Amino acid sequence: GTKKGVSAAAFSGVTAALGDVGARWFYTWAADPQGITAPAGTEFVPMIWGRDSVTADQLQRAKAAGSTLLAFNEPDLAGQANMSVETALDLWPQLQATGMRLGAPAVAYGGDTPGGWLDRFMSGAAARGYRVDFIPLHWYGGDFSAAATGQLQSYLQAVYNRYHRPIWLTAYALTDFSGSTPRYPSAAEQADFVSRSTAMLNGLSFVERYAWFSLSTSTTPTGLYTGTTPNSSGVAYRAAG
Numbered sequence: 001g002t003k004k005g006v007s008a009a010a011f012s013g014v015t016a017a018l019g020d021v022g023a024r025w026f027y028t029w030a031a032d033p034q035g036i037t038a039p040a041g042t043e044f045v046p047m048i049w050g051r052d053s054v055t056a057d058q059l060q061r062a063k064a065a066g067s068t069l070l071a072f073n074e075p076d077l078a079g080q081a082n083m084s085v086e087t088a089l090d091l092w093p094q095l096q097a098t099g100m101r102l103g104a105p106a107v108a109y110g111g112d113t114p115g116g117w118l119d120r121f122m123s124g125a126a127a128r129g130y131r132v133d134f135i136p137l138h139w140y141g142g143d144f145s146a147a148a149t150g151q152l153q154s155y156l157q158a159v160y161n162r163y164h165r166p167i168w169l170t171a172y173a174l175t176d177f178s179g180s181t182p183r184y185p186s187a188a189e190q191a192d193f194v195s196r197s198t199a200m201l202n203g204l205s206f207v208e209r210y211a212w213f214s215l216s217t218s219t220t221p222t223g224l225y226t227g228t229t230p231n232s233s234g235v236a237y238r239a240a241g
């Protein structure tokens with residue numbers, strides 16, 4: 001029951017949307033809920049987004065707003081946190097000193113690749129005697145068939161096997177980023193994938209939490225809700241255990 005969550009930004013109705021979709025948890029890519037009121041029984045998870053998020057005020061805000069902390073967002077990408085492994089490791093003791101359950105930085109891709117961003121982070125954390133409690137991952141599928149759920153699962157299993165930490169899926173959907181602009185599935189293809197993916201993730205015992213990207217169509221064409229109205233994907237996510 002506890003696995004299903006979502007990423008969110010504020011809007012009139014965001015609270016009722018979080019409640020109605022059945023999110024057990026959420027995050028906002030920031031250290032606090034960014035003005036959002038959590039529904040009863042929905043846990044806020046803070047994030048230290050990037051290098052310049054590592055301050056006394058952000059770390060205090062994070063420890064006051066929740067119990068679990070997510071570290072930097074896609075440091076492997078020039079358009080996101082855009083950090084070396086050395087920079088992430090050098091900042092790590094400040095996140096560790098909060099005492100909160102701590103998630104690895106969330107890499108865009110290649111989490112299972114030897115010599116990749118995550119492999120070098122995990123290996124330096126182990127050499128320095130650091131704590132990494134769990135690994136959050138991002139996945140966007142470019143094959144829009146019933147085969148997509150098996151492909152996402154191969155990726156989560158590859159990362160779980162290499163590092164032996166509980167997995168969170170903090171951002172996923174069907175999106176093909178290989179072309180000049182993003183390519184999306186049909187509404188019926190996206191709804192079917194929501195249904196098959198959540199059933200797979202619910203039974204996959206080393207996955208602790210997952211978060212569809214994202215709650216609102218004002219954030220992304222893969223959104224579940226327009227204002228407080230769910231689309232067929234929103235309906236399929238609400239029905240997931």
Ligand SMILES: OC[C@H]1O[C@@H](O[C@@H]2[C@@H](O)[C@H](O[C@@H]3[C@@H](O)[C@H](O[C@@H]4[C@@H](O)[C@H](O[C@@H]5[C@@H](O)[C@@H](O)O[C@H](CO)[C@H]5O)O[C@H](CO)[C@H]4O)O[C@H](CO)[C@H]3O)O[C@H](CO)[C@H]2O)[C@H](O)[C@@H](O)[C@@H]1O
Binds near residue numbers: 081138171
């Ligand atoms: O120094 C590195 C860069 O720092 C910037 O300054 C920081 C500033 O950006 C940051 O603000 C937060 C936003 O970055 C954050 O943005 C969210 C995205 O990261 C997220 O990205 C997803 C991605 O995770 C993946 O899933 O793929 C998705 C599809 O492509 C992609 O969208 O998307 C969400 C939804 O749109 C974004 O909201 O949002 C936070 C909440 O609003 C912001 O707080 O804050 C830090 C300080 O805390 C700043 O340092 C500079 O501007 C850059 O120039 C630097 O290179």
Ligand SMILES: OC[C@H]1O[C@@H](O)[C@H](O)[C@@H](O)[C@@H]1O
Binds near residue numbers: 108109139140
């Ligand atoms: O642009 C390329 C895309 O790569 C994906 O795998 C990342 O998660 C996105 O943040 C990014 O937009």
Ligand SMILES: [Zn+2]
Binds near residue numbers: 086087090
């Ligand atoms: Zn250093």
